[PDB]
Amino acid sequence: QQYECVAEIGEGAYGKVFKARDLKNGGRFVALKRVRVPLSTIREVAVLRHLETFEHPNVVRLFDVCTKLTLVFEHVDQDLTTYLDKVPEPGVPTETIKDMMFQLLRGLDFLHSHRVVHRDLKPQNILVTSSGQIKLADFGLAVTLWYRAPEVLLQSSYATPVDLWSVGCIFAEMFRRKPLFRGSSDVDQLGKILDVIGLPGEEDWPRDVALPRQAFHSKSAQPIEKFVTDIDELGKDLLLKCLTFNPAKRISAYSALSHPYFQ
Numbered sequence: 001q002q003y004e005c006v007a008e009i010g011e012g013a014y015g016k017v018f019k020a021r022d023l024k025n026g027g028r029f030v031a032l033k034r035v036r037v038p039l040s041t042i043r044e045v046a047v048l049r050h051l052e053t054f055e056h057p058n059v060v061r062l063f064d065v066c067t068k069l070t071l072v073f074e075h076v077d078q079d080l081t082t083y084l085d086k087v088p089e090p091g092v093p094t095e096t097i098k099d100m101m102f103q104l105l106r107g108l109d110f111l112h113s114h115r116v117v118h119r120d121l122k123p124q125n126i127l128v129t130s131s132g133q134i135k136l137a138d139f140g141l142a143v144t145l146w147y148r149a150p151e152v153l154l155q156s157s158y159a160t161p162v163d164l165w166s167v168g169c170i171f172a173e174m175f176r177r178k179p180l181f182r183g184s185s186d187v188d189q190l191g192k193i194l195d196v197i198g199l200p201g202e203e204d205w206p207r208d209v210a211l212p213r214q215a216f217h218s219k220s221a222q223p224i225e226k227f228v229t230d231i232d233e234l235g236k237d238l239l240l241k242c243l244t245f246n247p248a249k250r251i252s253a254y255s256a257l258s259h260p261y262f263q
């Protein structure tokens with residue numbers, strides 16, 4: 001074969017991910033994902049090959065697609081989790097947090113501009129290069145709810161704002177070095193969220209959903225500086241705009257890119 005598996009990276013629905021040697025390309029390490037067997041998946045791979053044409057700096061490269069289906073991607077040694085685990089005290093430098101957030105928002109804006117939603121953005125799929133470059137991986141194909149948006153938990157809407165909530169969760173975790181909302185179920189997750197952001201107005205609660213607003217009594221919203229201690233005034237504002245309950249009022253990746261926090 002042209003690829004030689006050396007280790008298992010992970011397991012997905014229904015497929016395994018393997019670290020492989022690209023024998024025809026200098027034995028470079030590659031991530032091989034096998035997708036089992038449709039037309040929707042054919043379209044999904046077509047979107048991924050199209051996004052590759054733009055070769056965005058903040059998205060993992062798709063080197064090859066073979067025919068059930070093998071997806072060959074560039075290998076990145078570490079994810080944001082392993083970076084946050086190994087970063088020395090007192091934590092990630094303020095300007096490293098800033099740069100990585102801009103790169104994440106750049107890759108996110110790229111995907112949203114091409115009508116692609118990640119839907120499972122988490123430090124495990126955010127890859128960090130030896131040069132410190134953020135690369136998005138593990139998206140475009142069809143459990144941890146710590147980054148799941150409230151409208152996904154409530155089962156009402158599944159648009160792009162879902163990823164911006166995950167970014168707000170990730171932004172907070174870059175300072176904390178531990179997840180912001182560590183729920184253990186959809187109802188626990190939403191409760192743990194509303195303890196911090198407060199119960200939203202009745203007009204901001206999704207209509208025709210199973211869980212009503214009155215199923216929670218989180219009462220008032222607490223200051224974020226308590227849960228994220230070293231955040232600046234501008235960072236606090238960007239973080240709040242991401243962690244907005246109502247997805248229509250939540251900042252977009254495009255307007256987050258222009259926030260004064262990045263000036």
Ligand SMILES: CC(C)n1c(C(C)(C)O)nc2c(F)cc(-c3nc(N[C@@H]4CCOC[C@H]4O)ncc3Cl)cc21
Nearest residue numbers: 010011012031033060073074075076124125137138
């Ligand atoms: C693991 C997970 C995020 N993952 C999943 C599933 C479906 C399991 O969630 N599919 C994945 C996939 F298609 C590719 C990668 C990927 N991984 C690396 N490197 C890894 C990063 C983690 O540390 C070990 C390194 O070797 N480099 C490049 C890519 Cl693109 C990760 C995937």
